[PDB]
């Protein structure tokens, strides 16, 4: 008896599940994935050997910062977009928190000036946007003409000649450019008339109206669609040219077609390189690469190989197709080392000289190399098909964290997504479209807020706790509708397009064997409602 | 020469393949599945250990029984449904196998009496349904007003306060309720006027017209859409509160965030629990759980660990999230035990005391735990996407037997499929739609019978020997059509929407390597028919 009371009480404990607002990616960050390849046959390759490897790639040293965009929307009917001039940004937006009702635009190649409801030039205060996230803040004058101001993420990568905005647009000027001595030599594609730098600038929040306590240097630039501004800072000091990307526990090397070919079970890729080592020591002044390669190789050897294998010699270095560098240390198993010892009684130099020993090894290791290659093609084929069906799930599973993703052709675009606490989400009582009697929503409508005191935002329940801003998933209202949707650890049950109750995850049967089901399943018999 | 004669002769031996009628699930049985989770990083977790585990879950002891539904269909044009009163069930249906032509219904909130073809009240005989399965047998008076009687499966689970019908409808009354001394205390939500119990009831089959040789107690209940009746029997005696769900061959336990986290390669669920054991012996009177936990742990240890590991101590017990209880016995491998021996000379209590030994173990086992977690997320991601494309195949593969399945939102509904012998199936000579010349059926039309002398039922050939009752898969007729469909341990070939012949599975080429195909494939050349 009593045990059921304890179980009933424990069944109240819900998982720490949360909702996520995953906005659509703009293409500011795209990532590739591997394609299945023509796998080689076992007779191919020579001089097979096993060893430890450490793969490095070009260190691009990303520099993330925040930029503010300012622009005017114009509708006259005839839709247009225009940048805010520096004088309006400094003397009205930053100084007072207002924009001019006037907006210059172009129609039939001639300049024209628009106004709010054809009224005279007047100052208008900006109000924070309703749907905007706590991080990606924004403000606007309305809700004709409308003044808009938005704070967005920006990224620049080595050599820092350009930066990309969270909107997917590029700016062909260095984030470090400026009139300051060490900065007037940085890259810029724009005429001097399109750029302005303000020393001793003091910001003013469009929300709290609080003016900044300390001065900064602000850069401003006029693009034909909007003006961009960001806080200038001196360039970051230099760093190592390559970064340690992967530490492989085991890696087979073989000569094939006059080039080395590297492969392992873990790494889905295979590296092709020349038979000549790269002269790393001449360029790696200070041992950025040497120190890490030696440390990682010894650590991996100690962790496993120490009791069963022997090192052939000192680590080697090779450059492969793409941006990669491979540090490598070939190994010999104790059982194989004994063969070289006995054949010597008739030491790196011996390895590929004993044709009778190597003939066995070429087949013995070739067996493994081909097995891994055929298996990786099978996994890639399945994973690449699933990626097209649900890029959000495959991207999140690949990365190990929730991310938003789009398929953007043959390359995947990705973005971070915002978590929302489960107590800030409310589910609406009906799934029917009030204005279109024959149509119903396919998934539940919801109302939520990013923060405990924020305004309620209308959305729709996506898959696996995702919250969508667009109430656009629709269906014809078919009869006999019953559905269970995932909602904050538990489920939410809808019957005939009407909300009824919430279930805990323990209220639904979990399957494992036919024995579990033979005692529960029934021969279902449809009732065909009128 | 002669070998081909033997091969040709053996090629006649077809497999023991069968057809299956998979009716659509009604939602009377729904099952959940795992969702990929946040995989922890190797630096997390402490006090890692390996051990044997036995997982138990709450025993709901399902009680399956047979119930009969009685109702009247009314069409006046204006469609309605009504229950058959007890007097009609006892005095006409069971007594004589007939229903009244009359039926009470409600229109515009007023009671009205319908009549079959506007004729006077008269008795109508019940005739067996054409399409009904041997198990879900049923009868009706026609083929206005129509009397219907159907025998369906019903299920009740602990505490047995309600039951669900194969139609997906619930009945808020205990199957054990009745006027008897030990039964009038059971649960019921309905007024006394809606229930009737008949002692000394003698059933009469609506088919054979034979009256039963022994008396029974029959319960009858009037729901606003049908009356339900079932044979009453005294409540089943009590059973153990938990059932042994899983025997886990190897289970890693680790402390993380002030809670134990369990994981294995096989069990896709990572159980979470408090650091304190449960007082099982205080509630497990008669050792329902203890006896099985001890027996299983010893059996699994003897089967493998017997010669390579040492038991730390007596089995422990922990209650986890959801309805689970975990019995656990931590182990130490012989090689690890020696490390504790050599440090002690300077027993269970020692395990987490030698910091330098545990630091090595935390990394060693942490490596494995993270590897399993990342692997399981990859498998779940692929399996969950495939489930949406073909729930019948994935439910059947998960269960290990043919089942009918439907996606019902974010939870899968399931039911049993009815097997049909291959000699009882016939394929129709054409797949063109006679009444709609521009359209053709997507898959072959068929005729079959569940039993060797039963009437022929018209249907359509589904995927992998499934037989569908609705001829609804359609396409526009296109020139150059050629198709091979799976049909009873072989194939059936259709050309230009017409049936031609049957093939054995041996008449088609099986692929294994490119060598098999390089000698067979051609550079196909399209002939573009007129």
């Amino acid at each position, epitope marked *: 008896a009593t045990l059921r009371a304890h179980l009933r009480e424990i069944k109240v404990e819900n998982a720490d599940a949360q909702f996520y607002v995953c906005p659509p990616p703009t293409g500011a960050t795209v990532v590739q994935f591997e394609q299945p390849r023509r796998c080689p046959t076992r007779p191919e390759g020579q001089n097979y050997t096993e060893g430890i490897a450490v793969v490095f790639k070009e260190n691009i040293a990303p520099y993330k910062f925040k930029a503010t965009m300012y622009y005017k929307d114009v509708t006259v009917i005839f839709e247009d977009r225009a940048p805010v001039p520096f004088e309006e940004v400094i003397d009205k937006i930053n100084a007072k928190g207002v924009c001019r009702s006037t907006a210059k635009y172009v129609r039939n190649n001639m300049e024209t000036t628009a106004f709010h409801r054809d009224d005279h030039e007047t100052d208008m205060e900006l109000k924070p946007a309703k749907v905007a996230t706590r991080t990606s803040r924004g403000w606007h004058t309305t809700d004709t003409v409308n003044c808009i101001v938005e704070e967005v993420d920006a990224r620049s990568v080595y050599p820092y000649d350009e930066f990309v905005l969270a909107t997917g647009d590029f700016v062909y000027m260095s984030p470090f450019y400026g009139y300051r001595e060490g900065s007037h030599t940085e890259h810029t594609s724009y005429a001097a008339d399109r750029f302005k730098q303000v020393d001793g600038f003091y910001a003013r929040d469009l929300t709290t109206k609080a003016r900044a306590t300390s001065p900064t240097t602000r850069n401003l630039l006029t693009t034909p669609k909007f003006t961009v501004a960001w806080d200038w800072v001196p360039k970051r000091p230099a760093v190592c040219t390559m970064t340690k990307w992967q530490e492989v526990d085991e890696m087979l090397r073989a000569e094939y077609g006059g080039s080395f070919r590297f492969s392992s079970d873990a790494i889905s890729t295979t590296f092709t390189t020349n038979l000549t080592q790269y002269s790393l020591s001449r360029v790696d002044l200070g041992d950025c690469i040497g120190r890490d390669a030696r440390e990682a190789i010894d650590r991996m050897f100690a962790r496993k190989y120490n009791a069963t294998h022997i090192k052939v010699g000192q680590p080697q270095y090779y450059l492969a197709t793409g941006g990669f560098l491979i540090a490598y240390q070939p190994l010999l198993s104790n059982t194989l080392a004994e063969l070289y010892v006995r054949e010597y009684m008739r030491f790196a130099r011996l390895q590929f000289t004993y044709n009778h020993i190597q003939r066995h090894v070429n087949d013995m290791l070739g067996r493994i190399a081909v097995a891994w290659c055929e298996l990786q093609n099978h996994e890639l084929t399945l994973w690449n098909e699933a990626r097209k069906l649900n890029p959000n799930a495959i991207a999140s599973a690949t990365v190990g964290r929730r991310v938003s993703a789009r398929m953007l052709g043959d390359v995947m675009a990705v973005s971070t997504c915002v978590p929302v606490a489960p107590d800030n989400v409310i589910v609406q009582n009906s799934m029917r479209v009030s204005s279109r009697p024959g149509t119903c929503y396919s998934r539940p409508l919801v109302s939520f807020r990013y923060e405990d005191q924020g305004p309620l935002i209308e959305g729709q329940l996506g898959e696996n706790n995702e919250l969508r801003l667009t109430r656009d998933a629709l269906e014809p209202c078919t009869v006999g509708h019953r559905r269970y949707f995932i909602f904050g650890g538990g489920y939410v049950y809808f019957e005939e397009y009407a*909300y009824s109750h919430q279930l805990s995850r323990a209220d639904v049967t979990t399957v494992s064997t036919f024995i579990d089901l033979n005692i529960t399943m029934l021969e279902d018999h449809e009732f065909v409602p009128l | 020469a002669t070998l081909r004669a033997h091969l040709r002769e053996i090629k006649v031996e077809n497999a023991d393949a069968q057809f299956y009628v998979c009716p659509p699930p009604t939602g009377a049985t729904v099952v959940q599945f795992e969702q990929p989770r946040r995989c922890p990083t190797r630096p997390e977790g402490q006090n890692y250990t390996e051990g044997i585990a036995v997982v138990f879950k709450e025993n709901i002891a399902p009680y399956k029984f047979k119930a009969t539904m009685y109702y009247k269909d009314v069409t006046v044009i204006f469609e309605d449904r009504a229950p058959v009163p007890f007097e009609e069930v006892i005095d006409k249906i069971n007594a004589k196998g007939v229903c009244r032509s009359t039926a009470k219904y409600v229109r515009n909130n007023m009671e009205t009496t319908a009549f079959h073809r506007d004729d006077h009240e008269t008795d109508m005989e019940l005739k067996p349904a054409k399409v009904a399965t041997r198990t879900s047998r049923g009868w009706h008076t026609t083929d206005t007003v129509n009397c219907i009687v159907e025998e369906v499966d019903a299920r009740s689970v602990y505490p047995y306060d309600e039951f669900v019908l194969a139609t997906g409808d619930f009945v808020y009354m205990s199957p054990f309720y009745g006027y008897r001394e030990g039964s009038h205390t059971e649960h019921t939500s309905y007024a006394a006027d809606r229930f009737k119990q008949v002692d000394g009831f003698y059933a009469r089959d609506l088919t054979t017209k034979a009256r039963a040789t022994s008396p029974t107690t029959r319960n009858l209940l009037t729901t606003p859409k049908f009356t339900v009746a079932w044979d009453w029997v005294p409540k089943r005696p009590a059973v153990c509160t938990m059932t042994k769900w899983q025997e886990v061959d190897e289970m890693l336990r680790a402390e993380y965030g002030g809670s134990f986290r369990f994981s294995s390669d096989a069990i896709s669920t990572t159980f979470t629990t408090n650091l304190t054991q449960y007082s099982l012996s205080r509630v497990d009177l008669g050792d329902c759980i203890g006896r099985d936990a001890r027996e299983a742990i010893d059996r699994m240890f003897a089967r493998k660990y017997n010669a390579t590991h040492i038991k730390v101590g007596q089995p422990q017990y922990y209650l986890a999230t959801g309805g689970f209880l975990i019995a656990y016995q931590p182990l130490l491998s012989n090689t690890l035990a020696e490390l504790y021996v050599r440090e002690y000379m300077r027993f269970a209590r020692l395990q987490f005391t030698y910091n330098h030994i545990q630091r090595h173990v935390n990394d060693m086992l942490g490596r494995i735990a993270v590897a399993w977690c990342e692997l399981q997320n990859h498998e779940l991601t692929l399996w969950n996407e495939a489930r949406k494309l073909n729930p019948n195949a994935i439910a059947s593969a998960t269960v290990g037997r043919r089942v009918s399945a439907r996606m019902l939102g974010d939870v899968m509904a399931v039911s049993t499929c009815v097997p049909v012998a291959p000699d009882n199936v016939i394929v129709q000579n054409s797949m063109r739609v006679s009444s709609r010349p521009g359209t053709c059926y997507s898959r072959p039309l068929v005729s079959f019978r569940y039993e060797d002398q039963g009437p022929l039922i018209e249907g359509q050939l589904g995927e992998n020997n499934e037989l569908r009752l609705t001829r609804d898969a359609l396409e526009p007729c296109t020139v150059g059509h050629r198709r091979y469909f799976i049909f009873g341990g072989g194939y059936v070939y259709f050309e230009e929407y017409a049936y031609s012949h049957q093939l054995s599975r041996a008449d088609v080429t099986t692929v294994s390597t490119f060598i098999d195909l390089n000698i067979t494939m051609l550079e196909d050349h399209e002939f573009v028919p007129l």
Partner: nanobody
Framework: QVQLVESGGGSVQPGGSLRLSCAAS??????????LGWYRQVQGKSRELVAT???????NYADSVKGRFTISIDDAENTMYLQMNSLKPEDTGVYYC?????????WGKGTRVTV
């Protein structure tokens, strides 16, 4: 999880009237419940059926109560009420609200009524 907060109990002389109420948390919508109702305990008996709504439009009452009491619901407030008119001394006991959705079941902490 669903919570049923019950209120409206007390004491009145014979021939008086009362109104019990049972409000539910957002996690369980009463208008969609498969069976809603009030059950009474008496010193020498188990839970008697008092009044229920066994389908979204059906109704049930005890023989000894039919005509005096009335059950109703409010979908906006997510609350159900039991209007009790012309009480008798026999109506004394502990009343418990119950609501159940497709196999999930919930009981309120019973309120006392005495005459």
């Amino acid at each position: 999880q669903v919570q049923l907060v019950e209120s409206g109990g007390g004491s009145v002389q014979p021939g008086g009237s009362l109104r019990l109420s049972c409000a539910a948390s957002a996690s369980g919508r009463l208008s969609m419940s498969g069976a809603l109702g009030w059950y009474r305990q008496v010193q020498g008996k188990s839970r008697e059926l008092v009044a229920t709504i066994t389908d979204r439009s059906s109704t049930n009452y005890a023989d000894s109560v039919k005509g005096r009491f009335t059950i109703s619901i409010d979908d906006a407030e997510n609350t159900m009420y039991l209007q009790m008119n012309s009480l008798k001394p026999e109506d004394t006991g502990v009343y418990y609200c119950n609501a159940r959705w497709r196999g999930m079941n919930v009981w309120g902490k019973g309120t006392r009524v005495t005459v």
